[PDB]
Scaffold this active site. Structure first.
Site, mmCIF file in Angstrom:
data_model
loop_
_atom_site.group_PDB
_atom_site.id
_atom_site.type_symbol
_atom_site.label_atom_id
_atom_site.label_comp_id
_atom_site.label_asym_id
_atom_site.label_seq_id
_atom_site.Cartn_x
_atom_site.Cartn_y
_atom_site.Cartn_z
ATOM 1 N N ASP A 98 9.168 12.959 -103.935
ATOM 2 C CA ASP A 98 9.187 13.768 -102.723
ATOM 3 C C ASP A 98 8.553 15.129 -102.999
ATOM 4 O OD1 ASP A 98 10.591 11.863 -101.064
ATOM 5 O OD2 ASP A 98 12.365 12.318 -102.232
ATOM 6 N N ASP A 101 3.843 20.370 -99.727
ATOM 7 C CA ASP A 101 2.669 21.187 -100.005
ATOM 8 C C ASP A 101 2.612 22.317 -98.985
ATOM 9 O OD1 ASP A 101 1.864 19.499 -102.070
ATOM 10 O OD2 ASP A 101 -0.016 18.858 -101.032
HETATM 11 C C1 ASD Z 1 -1.315 15.401 -107.113
HETATM 12 C C2 ASD Z 1 -0.200 14.778 -106.251
HETATM 13 C C3 ASD Z 1 -0.820 14.114 -105.016
HETATM 14 C C4 ASD Z 1 -1.509 15.107 -104.090
HETATM 15 C C5 ASD Z 1 -0.608 16.233 -103.705
HETATM 16 O O1 ASD Z 1 -0.816 16.897 -102.700
HETATM 17 C C6 ASD Z 1 0.498 16.535 -104.605
HETATM 18 C C7 ASD Z 1 0.703 15.910 -105.772
HETATM 19 C C8 ASD Z 1 1.754 16.409 -106.728
HETATM 20 C C9 ASD Z 1 2.491 15.301 -107.469
HETATM 21 C C10 ASD Z 1 1.498 14.348 -108.122
HETATM 22 C C11 ASD Z 1 0.616 13.712 -107.040
HETATM 23 C C12 ASD Z 1 -0.256 12.556 -107.561
HETATM 24 C C13 ASD Z 1 0.480 11.545 -108.436
HETATM 25 C C14 ASD Z 1 1.197 12.268 -109.576
HETATM 26 C C15 ASD Z 1 0.198 12.915 -110.555
HETATM 27 C C16 ASD Z 1 2.131 11.455 -110.449
HETATM 28 O O2 ASD Z 1 2.006 10.286 -110.724
HETATM 29 C C17 ASD Z 1 3.236 12.365 -110.941
HETATM 30 C C18 ASD Z 1 3.108 13.659 -110.125
HETATM 31 C C19 ASD Z 1 2.189 13.260 -108.953
#
Ligand code: ASD
Ligand code: ASD
Ligand code: CL
Ligand code: CL
Ligand code: MG
Lengths: 126, 128
Positions: A98, A101
């Site tokens: 969860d 942004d």
């Molecule tokens: C980059 C991202 C999506 C775009 C967005 O707006 C916010 C996030 C933060 C959490 C990220 C995620 C992508 C998938 C990630 C890398 C994982 O597998 C663990 C943490 C998570």
């Protein structure tokens, strides 16, 4: 700056692009001097190559999904905040995260700052 | 309390919503640092300090008939910050309305709210 309604559209578009995994389209949404703080608390990422690498690292596998869990909240000063859930596979284990942004947009409708609020308290092993 | 951990941020921010929901203005004000700022809605001028913050909550909540509930979990950082989605229910034109909001908070080293930003505008207001 983008109006409140335009902020809602832009931030939903961002989630649609994350969900399909279009890294180039995501990076195009950002301004030249944009910063990404993801997770919030970590040092900001800056530089277009660096932002692209960040999204490639996060979405490269192609098996990440993302969907809004409620409406985009938008201001009158080109900013907004949205709640969503990311689904991914972590060392073979399906998981969900969860996230909220917060984004500020510039006069050209491009993302000037993004801040992603989440930590392991927001992670669920499915 | 020290600078809150991620788990402590989730508890603090959830309690804040409980206090809004019941309308305990004095208890809300005491969750804030003495010199806290609030920007609500984000985009408007900040207000500084418990005296101004108390006046703001009394003007928003003192009339009663406001309720508030989380619509999903608090998202918390490791630097004493968090963000939460919620919905405020109140009365508009004699009939129920709803306002979707996200609050972002930063806590101090004593577990008090140093800053709060509330994201919402009229696009987030709805009715039956
Ligand atoms: C980059 C991202 C999506 C775009 C967005 O707006 C916010 C996030 C933060 C959490 C990220 C995620 C992508 C998938 C990630 C890398 C994982 O597998 C663990 C943490 C998570
Ligand atoms: C102060 C407040 C609750 C605490 C919180 O955290 C965020 C908000 C922002 C919107 C306020 C609301 C209280 C009720 C208000 C005054 C209305 O009837 C219209 C706008 C709305
Ligand atoms: Cl929501
Ligand atoms: Cl949610
Ligand atoms: Mg202090």
């Amino acid at each position: 700056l983008p109006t409140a309604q335009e902020v809602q559209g832009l931030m939903a578009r961002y989630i649609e692009l994350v969900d399909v995994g279009d890294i180039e389209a995501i990076v195009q949404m950002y301004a030249d001097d944009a910063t990404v703080e993801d997770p919030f608390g970590q040092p900001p990422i800056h530089g277009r190559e660096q932002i692209a690498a960040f999204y490639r690292q996060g979405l490269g596998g192609g098996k990440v999904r993302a969907c809004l869990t409620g409406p985009v909240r938008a201001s009158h000063n080109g900013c907004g905040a949205m709640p969503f859930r990311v689904e991914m596979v972590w060392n073979g284990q399906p998981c969900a995260l969860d996230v909220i942004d917060v984004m500020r947009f510039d006069e050209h409708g491009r993302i000037q700052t993004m801040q992603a609020y989440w930590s392991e308290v927001n992670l669920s092993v499915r």
